[PDB]
Amino acid sequence: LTNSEKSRFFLADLTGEVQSIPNTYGYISGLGLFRSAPQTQTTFLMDLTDWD
């Protein structure tokens, strides 16, 4: 019971609360493929050695 429509002396029920939430995908992130490698600098280097 909040109020009527265009009259402050009558009432009406509530029910209400129909939430709508956007859909988010998390399959690749849920796969857990990537290993966390924290570092301190802003750039990092790697070496590539091959004796084919």
């Binding site: 429509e5 265009k6 009259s7 402050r8 002396f9 009558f10």
Partner: protein, 123 residues
């Protein structure tokens, strides 16, 4: 507030204008109208045959008196309905009639009285 005052509005009159009516199972004194066009209805206003109110000069029409508070803009009613209802047959009502500008009451009451509507004096 600005210009000193804001009034949120007098309450529209309730449906206590009834004192006695025929209590036929499917409605003897009640008749069914359709709101015409952007027209606001309250209780106790005299309505013509075609859902419209009685203006000056056309007092003889005086089909019925409204018993609902219809809101024109949303096309719903005082109770949340699609159609305005007035009372047009034999019944007894308080004389709380709502009349337009330039329309006298004696001709309106006489037209309603000849139809069966009697108006109990009110204090």
């Amino acid at each position: 507030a600005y210009q000193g005052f804001t009034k949120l509005g007098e309450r529209e009159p309730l449906n206590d204008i009834i004192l006695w009516e025929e209590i036929t199972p499917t409605g003897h004194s009640r008749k069914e109208y359709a709101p015409v066009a952007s027209t606001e209805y309250r209780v106790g206003e005299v309505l013509k045959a075609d859902g419209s109110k009685v203006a000056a000069g056309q007092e003889a029409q005086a089909d019925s008196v409204c018993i609902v508070n219809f809101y024109a803009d949303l096309q719903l009613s005082y109770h949340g309905q699609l159609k305005v209802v007035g009372i047009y047959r034999d019944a007894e009502l308080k004389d709380l009639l709502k009349l337009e500008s330039g329309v006298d009451a004696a001709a309106v009451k006489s037209a309603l009285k000849a139809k069966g509507i009697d108006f109990v004096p009110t204090g």
